[PDB]
Amino acid sequence: VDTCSLASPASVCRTKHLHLRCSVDFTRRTLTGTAALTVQSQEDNLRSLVLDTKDLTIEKVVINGQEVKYALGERQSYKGSPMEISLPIALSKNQEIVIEISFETSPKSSALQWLTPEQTSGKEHPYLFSQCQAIHCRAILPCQDTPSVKLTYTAEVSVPKELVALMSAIRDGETPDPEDPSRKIYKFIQKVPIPCYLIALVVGALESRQIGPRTLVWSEKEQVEKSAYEFSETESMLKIAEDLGGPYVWGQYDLLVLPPSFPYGGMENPCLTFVTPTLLAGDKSLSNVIAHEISHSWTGNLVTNKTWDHFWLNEGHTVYLERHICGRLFGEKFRHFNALGGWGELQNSVKTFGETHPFTKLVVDLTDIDPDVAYSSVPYEKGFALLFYLEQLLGGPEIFLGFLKAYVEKFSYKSITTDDWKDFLYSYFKDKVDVLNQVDWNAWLYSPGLPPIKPNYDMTLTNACIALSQRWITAKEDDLNSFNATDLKDLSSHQLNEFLAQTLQRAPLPLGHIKRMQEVYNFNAINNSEIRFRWLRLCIQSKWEDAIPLALKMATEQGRMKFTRPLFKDLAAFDKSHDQAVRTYQEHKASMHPVTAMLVGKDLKVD
Ligand SMILES: c1ccc(Cc2ccc(OCCN3CCCC3)cc2)cc1
Ligand SMILES: [Yb+3]
Ligand SMILES: [Yb+3]
Ligand SMILES: [Yb+3]
Numbered sequence: 001v002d003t004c005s006l007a008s009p010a011s012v013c014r015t016k017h018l019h020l021r022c023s024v025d026f027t028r029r030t031l032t033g034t035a036a037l038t039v040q041s042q043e044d045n046l047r048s049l050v051l052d053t054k055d056l057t058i059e060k061v062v063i064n065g066q067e068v069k070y071a072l073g074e075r076q077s078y079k080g081s082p083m084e085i086s087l088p089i090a091l092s093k094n095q096e097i098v099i100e101i102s103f104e105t106s107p108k109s110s111a112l113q114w115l116t117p118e119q120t121s122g123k124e125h126p127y128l129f130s131q132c133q134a135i136h137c138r139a140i141l142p143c144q145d146t147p148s149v150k151l152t153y154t155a156e157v158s159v160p161k162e163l164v165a166l167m168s169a170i171r172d173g174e175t176p177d178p179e180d181p182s183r184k185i186y187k188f189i190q191k192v193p194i195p196c197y198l199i200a201l202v203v204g205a206l207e208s209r210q211i212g213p214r215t216l217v218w219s220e221k222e223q224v225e226k227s228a229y230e231f232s233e234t235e236s237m238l239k240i241a242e243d244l245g246g247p248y249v250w251g252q253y254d255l256l257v258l259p260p261s262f263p264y265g266g267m268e269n270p271c272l273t274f275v276t277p278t279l280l281a282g283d284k285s286l287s288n289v290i291a292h293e294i295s296h297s298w299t300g301n302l303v304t305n306k307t308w309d310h311f312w313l314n315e316g317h318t319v320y321l322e323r324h325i326c327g328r329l330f331g332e333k334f335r336h337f338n339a340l341g342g343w344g345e346l347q348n349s350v351k352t353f354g355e356t357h358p359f360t361k362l363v364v365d366l367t368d369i370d371p372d373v374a375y376s377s378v379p380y381e382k383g384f385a386l387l388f389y390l391e392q393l394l395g396g397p398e399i400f401l402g403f404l405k406a407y408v409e410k411f412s413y414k415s416i417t418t419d420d421w422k423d424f425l426y427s428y429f430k431d432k433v434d435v436l437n438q439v440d441w442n443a444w445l446y447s448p449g450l451p452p453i454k455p456n457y458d459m460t461l462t463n464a465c466i467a468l469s470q471r472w473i474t475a476k477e478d479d480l481n482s483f484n485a486t487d488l489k490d491l492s493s494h495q496l497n498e499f500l501a502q503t504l505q506r507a508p509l510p511l512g513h514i515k516r517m518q519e520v521y522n523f524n525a526i527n528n529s530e531i532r533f534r535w536l537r538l539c540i541q542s543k544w545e546d547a548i549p550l551a552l553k554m555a556t557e558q559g560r561m562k563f564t565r566p567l568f569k570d571l572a573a574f575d576k577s578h579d580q581a582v583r584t585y586q587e588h589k590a591s592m593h594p595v596t597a598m599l600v601g602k603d604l605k606v607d
């Protein structure tokens with residue numbers, strides 16, 4: 001039972017293919033067209049089925065060349081409205097038919113952000129991008145919007161001829177639109193079956209540059225050179241990921257660098273990973289996000305969570321592979337450093353929700369929960385922690401990597417649950433069942449809070465971060481003189497970030513301490529997004545008024561939720577900035593990403 005979908009389940013019928021023919025209208029902010037779903041009955045005498053929709057206008061539904069009856073049910077909040085279609089002829093088990101639905105999206109589509117020219121780098125052309133995970137594909141087109149169903153797709157997209165369309169698919173040519181010479185039709189084919197949350201579309205003034213044998217970077221012209229350099233390690237990471245996961249099956253691995261309002265670090269859309277421009281640090285230091293997106297090409301896109309309750313399967317395993325890629329490139333002490341950092345982020349998330357809160361469970365129950373409200377670091381880091389604990393229990397990283405590869409092989413092209421994963425774990429490790437039975441499975445999988453056991457972490461690279469953080473926290477006024485720029489001499493950017501993360505966990509610090517930190521370290525000068533984020537949070541929580549304009553600027557000039565939500569929440573909690581935070585949100589709300597607008601509004605208690 002997928003409790004996030006109103007459509008007929010996979011036990012009733014299954015979509016095998018989508019053919020999407022649509023046109024992008026920037027004047028109306030609508031996508032208009034036809035979705036032809038090839039559907040296979042899983043039942044005898046099948047006479048109707050139900051699809052998910054959200055803010056879609058349906059013109060007609062055509063089967064065997066004739067219009068058929070359909071009905072849209074009442075809207076069920078964030079789940080949208082179920083669409084029941086009456087089949088003209090009853091279907092036998094395994095029979096396939098094609099259902100062509102003519103539809104139009106709403107400008108308010110929660111899957112889409114429509115950008116005006118002034119919101120882009122070039123200032124001349126508008127821009128459109130989608131983001132369907134978890135349950136927003138239904139806000140683009142009618143579908144069984146559940147990751148328990150996998151389908152191939154083809155698409156033809158008409159756009160203004162001056163712009164470029166790209167999708168999560170192999171590019172299959174372009175031509176002028178025979179209905180309109182002011183437009184072009186771009187074509188696409190995705191021959192590997194995918195869950196519908198991986199469908200993606202971008203339209204804008206895009207240019208490309210080759211950066212490896214199977215990778216182009218795409219962005220607006222003004223970001224192409226910087227992006228090519230920032231992500232130059234991509235092919236080396238793909239080669240490592242293939243060694244760990246098995247063959248890369250998707251053909252191309254392209255990267256799209258979105259405008260700053262993209263709400264996430266990355267989205268693993270097949271053939272075309274989407275990433276935030278906040279990765280453009282200038283030194284490749286945020287490349288773990290690329291390693292993460294790469295890893296999803298196996299864990300998530302090949303082996304897929306059957307329902308969103310089991311999202312940790314996607315994320316825990318991807319973070320586990322991510323950290324192995326970074327360990328291969330930069331050493332095992334670095335893998336441990338990042339693993340221990342991840343535990344810190346888990347501590348933060350658990351403290352934020354509360355240690356008994358149901359969103360801190362590894363396996364969640366999303367019945368009547370909007371997935372976007374539950375989303376956090378928990379499935380990532382509690383999931384990673386479980387796998388890291390199992391690695392240490394079962395004999396180390398090379399042994400556990402053997403399991404990961406066998407797991408990917410076993411469940412490729414399938415959708416699975418936590419119980420499927422555990423069953424296979426027990427099968428693979430049959431000779432170590434006695435060790436597996438020592439694990440507190442109920443606690444790890446189904447209890448809220450921090451896990452019942454913390455893994456063992458090498459501390460080598462973390463020690464200096466902790467030492468400096470503790471110096472600052474224990475400092476009194478007469479100790480402040482002792483701090484100096486040379487304190488940071490032997491710290492990498494990763495360590496500076498960890499120093500700030502450690503210190504932020506104990507915030508507020510005294511205002512005089514934070515002023516001294518700026519005097520001697522000049523953190524205001526650093527434009528690395530992760531470091532600047534934590535520094536500004538530290539300043540605002542410690543009640544430094546000078547930081548108010550800096551934090552408001554960062555909160556609004558980009559829209560990655562990891563940064564924008566906590567910055568607004570901190571600014572709201574600071575009496576001196578509270579009214580500015582609310583006013584700034586109100587003024588920007590109409591031009592924000594729809595999901596980000598909703599979540600910041602909820603965080604600020606502004607309706
Ligand atoms: C724990 C927390 C949340 C969930 C459900 C969930 C699953 C996927 C979600 O995707 C949100 C959008 N993606 C875009 C790329 C990173 C996040 C959001 C919510 C399950 C377990
Ligand atoms: Yb072709
Ligand atoms: Yb003293
Ligand atoms: Yb209001």
Ligand SMILES: [Zn+2]
Pocket residue numbers: 292296314315318
């Ligand atoms: Zn992920």
